[PDB]
């Protein structure tokens, strides 16, 4: 935050925009943050690189620990070298937790082999984690475990780069977001905004144009949710599309993804900026809290 | 930055993307000093727009505001300036991490006719030894290219006024970190900044251009100096306020380009450039003003 003379007009002006300002008449402790990533995605290293790229964009030091949900056999070397089990970290507190997506869009919760382990991490997070960010399927899991919302599935997979808008001009998690912006989705989970409004107390910060919640969070910042995959690389949707075409599914192209909707053309990461802002804002205002 | 075990694949992978990674070798974060030489005619609006952006960082940024003009040059006191601003002699023996020189209403004035040209030269010479990273905005770009590279002033045949399309040149650069491949930013200038001018008469790296061929962002490889030719700090309504004053003052002018919805000045304009203004100023603080 800036530190300026108490009566500079910027002080009252920026405070009215929900911006914290320091004044020369008053005065912080800025220590390394501890962030845990529960990696449920099957391509473990690709997912590590995607999230760690975006967790790199703060001047704050982010000490990262990687959490595995069970010990099912990614190289076994990789997990044994770099990941911890829940019993290894259960006595620790963290500033942040990310629960990634998982390929569980079409699996009932009672058929998810590690469902008990997921309930145990989410219950523990309430007292042990300052802010937990749930991504994609983890949003569906958390809506079920924290609010008793039953699984809801779309008619077809939402796959593409979609238009969104922010709802709160002065919010922290969307600080610097354009009024409308692009972010990618790849999900069977259905997240209509009305479901979040009618069955939770969460504040909705951004929606898709079609009426889905994209970003929402608790007022105390303990829990935050993102229903897209802003961490995806340019090619990530294309890899899923080509694997489904090879299997004989012969699906549509992802929306607004390939140039001219022709999969011979190279897709670009048209969603980069607001993925960077999102993770930078989550570290700077949710994981780190000046107050 | 993240701190992970040295052998994690992310380490070599993000280093190949020009991203600094700490590895689990030894884990004290200091306040930054930034000076703003405010040359804009709306001093308080300008302070609010740049301070909004410098506020979006966990780093503590101690701000001092610098005036170019003496207290006695004015027919009446400038209350605001007297209360909040220092003069050069007050800060000449201090060191700063950052300096911003704003734009100035001097696009049609020859440097030798600019009344405070000596004072501007004195600040720029001082900044070489006293400021880790200087950001020049709009006219200050022309001033700096003159003093540092001997480039004469160039003026466009027609004023640029609107929100224009841009692209980045360096996928892994620090100052454009997180920028989309193409993005919007406002311009409002007669100053002419063809990219060929920067390539052919300086050693500066060009990081982004307008679609019509102007340099928008460029910097030195040592990060001592950085240049922006547009106004991503502008509020939604800044171009609108100027447009309505021009209309009221009797000028026959088009709306600013790509600014009002449907090009209709009854429509509320949106700050369509907000995101890349935030990335720019956040990246400037984090990688240029703060280094280690």
From Swiss-Prot, chain A:
Belongs to the MetA family. Changing residue 44 to A: 22-fold decrease in Km for L-homoserine. Almost loss of catalytic activity. This is Homoserine O-succinyltransferase. Its EC number is 2.3.1.46. Induction: Contains two transcription starting points, P1 and P2, which are 74 bp apart. P1 is under negative control by methionine, whereas P2 is independent of the intracellular methionine concentration. Substrate binds at residues 157, 186, 243. PANTHER family: HOMOSERINE O-SUCCINYLTRANSFERASE (PTHR20919:SF0). GO terms for molecular function: homoserine O-acetyltransferase activity; homoserine O-succinyltransferase activity; protein homodimerization activity. Transfers a succinyl group from succinyl-CoA to L-homoserine, forming succinyl-L-homoserine. Utilizes a ping-pong kinetic mechanism in which the succinyl group of succinyl-CoA is initially transferred to the enzyme to form a succinyl-enzyme intermediate before subsequent transfer to homoserine to form the final product, O-succinylhomoserine. Cannot use acetyl-CoA. It comes from Escherichia coli (strain K12). One of its GO terms (biological process) is L-methionine biosynthetic process from homoserine via O-succinyl-L-homoserine and cystathionine. It catalyses: L-homoserine + succinyl-CoA = O-succinyl-L-homoserine + CoA. Its main location: cytoplasm.
């Amino acid at each position: 935050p800036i530190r300026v003379p108490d009566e500079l007009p910027a002080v009252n002006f920026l405070r009215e925009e929900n911006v914290f300002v320091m004044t020369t008449s008053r005065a912080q402790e800025i220590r390394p943050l501890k962030v845990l990533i529960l990696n449920l995605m099957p391509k473990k290293i690709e997912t590590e690189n995607q999230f760690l790229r975006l967790l790199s964009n703060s001047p704050l030091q982010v000490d990262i620990q990687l959490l595995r949900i069970d010990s099912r056999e990614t190289p076994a070397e990789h997990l044994n070298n770099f990941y911890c089990n829940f019993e290894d970290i259960q006595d620790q507190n963290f500033d942040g937790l990310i629960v990634t997506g998982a390929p569980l869009g079409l699996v009932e919760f009672n058929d998810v082999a590690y469902w008990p382990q997921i309930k145990q991490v989410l219950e523990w997070s309430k007292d042990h984690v300052t802010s937990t960010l749930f991504v994609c399927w983890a949003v569906q899991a958390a809506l079920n475990i924290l609010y008793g919302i039953p699984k809801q599935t779309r008619t077809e997979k939402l796959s593409g780069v979609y238009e969104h808008h922010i709802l709160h001009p002065h919010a922290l998690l969307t600080r610097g977001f354009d009024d409308s912006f692009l972010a990618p989705h790849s999900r069977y989970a259905d997240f209509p905004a009305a479901l979040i409004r009618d069955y939770t107390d969460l504040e909705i910060l951004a929606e898709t144009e079609e009426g889905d919640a994209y970003l929402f969070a608790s007022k105390d910042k303990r829990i935050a949710f993102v229903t897209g995959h802003p961490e995806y690389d340019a090619q990530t949707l294309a890899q899923e599309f080509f694997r489904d075409v090879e299997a004989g599914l012969d699906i549509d192209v992802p929306y607004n993804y390939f140039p001219h909707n022709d999969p011979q053309n190279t897709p670009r990461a048209s969603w980069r900026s607001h993925g960077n802002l999102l993770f930078t804002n989550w570290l700077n205002y949710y994981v780190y809290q000046i107050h």
